[PDB]
Amino acid sequence: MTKTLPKDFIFGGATAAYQAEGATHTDGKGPVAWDKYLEDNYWYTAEPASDFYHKYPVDLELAEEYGVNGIRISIAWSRIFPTGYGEVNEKGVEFYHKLFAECHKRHVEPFVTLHHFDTPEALHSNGDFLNRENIEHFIDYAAFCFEEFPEVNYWTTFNEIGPIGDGQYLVGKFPPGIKYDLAKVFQSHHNMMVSHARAVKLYKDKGYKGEIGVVHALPTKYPYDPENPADVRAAELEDIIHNKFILDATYLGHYSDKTMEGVNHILAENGGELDLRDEDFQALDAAKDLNDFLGINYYMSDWMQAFDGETEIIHNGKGEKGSSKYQIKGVGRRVAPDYVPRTDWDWIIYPEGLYDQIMRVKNDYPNYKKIYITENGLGYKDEFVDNTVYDDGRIDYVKQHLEVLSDAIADGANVKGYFIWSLMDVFSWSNGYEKRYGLFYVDFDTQERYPKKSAHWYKKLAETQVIE
C-alpha cells in the first residue's frame, strides 16, 4: 500500500564546484566574484569548503556504498580558463579527467554543469551575462569542454538562471549586489538563455554521444486568496518573473503574448529597457526541441498577494525565522500562509507544489521530453551526535516529495531521476556553513564524513524502490 518508483530511477546526490571544491587559489585557479564579495559582505569564506578537490575519492566510495548511482558535479570555468578565455589551464583540465574517471569506476554517473554561479571574475566584473561579449566566451568555453571531456554522457549548461537574476539584480544577495533592478533581471534571463540555446545547438551539431539540457529553478507561485483576481494576477506576474519568461524561451523559442504583456507592465511600473535582437530569437528558436531533459530544482512554494506600496525585499540569511520581506511595486507581496510548516530561513515546506509544477510544465510545454529532479533537500542546523545526525525531519521532507513524484509519474509525467541536495555538507551561498543539507555530515575541521540517518534511509530506498 506504499508508493514505489521505477526500477530504473536515478537516485543521485548533488554538488557545486565553488561550494565543495575549495582550493580557490590552487593549481592556477582564477578568481571568481565570490572571492572578494564573501570576504566583504559575509562571515565566512569558500575555504576550505568541504575539500572535494582532494576528497572526491572518499565521497564517491561512500556514495557508492549507500546506493547513489548519479551525481551532479560542475566544472569551474575559472579552473580551465582562469581569465574566462585565452589560455587553458593544464592542471585544471587534468583534475576533471581524474574526477570523472573516479565517478565511472565507482558506478556513479556524472551529470556535469558548465556554469553554477561562478562566472570567472574578469568577465563578471564586466557586466556578467548582461554584456553580450561574455556570451561569446561562454559558447567558446562550452565547445572546449564538449571536446575535451568525452567521458561525460550528460551535460547541463546553466544551473538556475532565474535565481541568478534574482540574486544579483533584484535581491542583491549575490554579487554585484544590485537591488530592485528588474530590467537587468530580464535582460539577464534573456541573455543567458541565448547562451544556452547556442551551446545546446553546437553540442547537437558536432554530434557528440550523450545528452544536454537545462537546470531551472521553479518554485510554484499561488495567489493568497484564489477567489481574488488581484491575488491571481499577483501570482501571475511573480511567476512570469521567475518561471514563465525563461520556460517560454526554453520551449517556444520566443516569449508568449501573456509573458510579454505581464513583462511590459512590470517594466512600466518600475521602469526599464529590454534589448532584444532578432538574431537572439533565431538562436532560441533553433534550440527549442534540442533539449534532451529538463532538470527541475525545487524547494518551496510562494503565495502572492496584491500590493500597492514601494518595493522592498529583505533576505533572511541568518535563519531568523520570520525576518523575510518581499514586496514589489506593481507585482505583489509574499504572504506566508498561516499554518504551513517552514524552516528557520522561511522556506515553506509544501510537497504538492512540486507535483503542480510538473503537471504545469507537462501541460504547457509538451516537448519537455524528460524530467529529472536535479535539486531537492532540507537545510537546517543538524545536531551531530553519536557520529551521526538523526535527521528524521530531513527524511520526512524527502519522503514526501518522492511520494509526490511517484504520483506525477503515475499521472503521465516522465520523471526519470531525483537528486538530493546535497551529497555531503557544503557551505551555503548566502547562509554560511550553518545551513546543512547533506546525506553525509562533514566536520569542517577534520573534513571527516559521517553518514547521517538519511544516508542509511537513502540506501534502502535506492535498492528497494519503495518509499517507506
HSE, side-chain direction, 13 A CA sphere, residue 432: 12
The 220-223 sheet, strands edge to edge: 220-223, 301-305, 332-334, 325-328, 312-314
**Catalytic residue set:** 160, 375
Position 445, amino acid: D
d(CA 11, CA 79) in angstroms, rounded, equals 29
Domain count, the chain: 1
Q: Is 437 annotated as a binding residue?
A: yes
Residue 103 amino acid letter = C
How far is it, in rounded angstroms, from Cα 143 to Cα 121? 20
Q: How far apart are CA 137 and CA 121, in angstroms?
A: 13
Spatial CB neighbours of 228, under 8 Å, sequence gap ≥ 6 = 306
Cell output for 319: 535563519
222 assigned ligand-binding residue? no
Instruction: Show the cell assigned to 108.
Output: 556513479
Q: Does the annotation flag 19 for ligand binding?
A: yes
Residue 297 assigned as binding residue:
yes
* 3-state SS, one letter per residue, for the chain: CCEECCCCCEEEEECCHHHHCCCCCCCCCCCECHHHHHHHHCCCCCCCCCCHHHHHHHHHHHHHHCCCCEEEEECCHHHHCCCCCCCCCHHHHHHHHHHHHHHHHCCCEEEEEEECCCCEHHHHCCCHHHCHHHHHHHHHHHHHHHHHCCCCCEEEEEECHHHHHHHHHHCCCCCCCCCCCHHHHHHHHHHHHHHHHHHHHHHHHCCCCCEEEEEEECCEEEECCCCCHHHHHHHHHHHHHHHHHHHHHHHCCCCCHHHHHHHHHHHHHHCCCCCCCHHHHHHHHHHCCCCCCEEEECCCEEEEECCCCCCEEECCCCCCCCCCEEEECCCEEECCCCCCCECCCCCECCCHHHHHHHHHHHHHCHHHCCEEEEECCCCECCCCECCECCCHHHHHHHHHHHHHHHHHHHCCCCEEEEEEECCECCCECCCECCCECCCEEEECCCCEEEECHHHHHHHHHHHHCEEC
* CB contact at 8 A, 338 and 348: no
Burial 226-238 (b: 16+ CB within 10 A, else e): eeeeebbbbbbbb
CA torsion angle 239 15 68 445 (round to 10): -130
Closest CA to 372 of 422, 423, 415: 415
Phi, psi of 205 (to 5 degrees): -70, -50
Residue 324 assigned to a binding site: no
Instruction: Return d(Cα 5, Cα 467) in angstroms, integer.
Output: 8
Angle, alpha carbons 419-5-157 (nearest 5°): 30
> Is 29 among the annotated ligand-binding positions?
no
Residue position matching grid coordinates 554584456: 131
Comparing CA positions, the residue from 10, 122, 112, 142 lying closest to residue 420 is 10
Compute the distance between CA of residue 355 and CA of residue 296 in angstroms, rounded to an integer.
11
Q: How far is CA 4 from the centre of its chain?
A: 26
The answer to whether 234 and 263 are in contact (CB under 8 A) is: no
Whole-angstrom distance, CA of residue 242 vs CA of residue 188 = 12
The three grid cell numbers given for residue 232, joined into one nine-digit string: 491571481
Query: Which residue carries 537545510 as its cell?
Result: 379
Domain of 356 in residue numbering reads as 1-468
Q: How far apart are CA 384 and CA 386, in angstroms?
A: 7
Pair 139, 199: CB distance under 8 Å = yes
Please, are residues 336 and 306 in contact by the beta-carbon 8 Å criterion?
A: no
Asked if residue 44 lies in contact with residue 22, where contact means CB atoms within 8 angstroms, the answer is: no
CB atoms within 10 A of CB 370: 16
The reported resolution of this PDB entry, expressed in Å, is 2.7
Question: Could you give the angle at the alpha carbon of 379 between the alpha carbons of 431 and 399, nearest 5°?
Answer: 165
Q: Tell me the β-bridge partners of 301.
A: 220
CA atoms within 13 A of residue 6's CA, in its CB half-sphere: 16
What CA–CA distance (Å, rounded) separates 436 from 260? 39
Task: Check whether 435 is labelled as a binding-site residue.
Answer: yes
What's the full length of the chain, in residues? 468
* CA diameter of the chain: 61
443 Cβ contact list (under 8 Å, min separation 6): 384, 450
* Residue 11 near residue 67, CB atoms below 8 Å: yes
> Using alpha carbons only, what angle is made at residue 270 by residues 268 and 276, rounded to the nearest 5 degrees?
60
Q: Is 279 annotated as a binding residue?
A: no
Grid cell, residue 41, equals 559582505
326 is in an annotated binding site: no
Grid cell digits, residue 259 = 509573458
| Distance between first and last Cα of the chain | 10
User: Is the distance from CB of 419 to CB of 10 less than 8 angstroms?
Assistant: yes
Strands 3-4 and 466-467: antiparallel
CB atoms within 10 A of CB 261: 14
What is the CATH number for 336? 3.20.20.80
Pick from 100, 94, 54: nearest CA to 73: 100
Query: For residue 250, which phi and psi values (nearest 5 degrees)?
Result: -70, -45
- Which phi and psi angles does 16 have, rounded to 5°? -145, 140
Method by which the coordinates were obtained:
X-ray
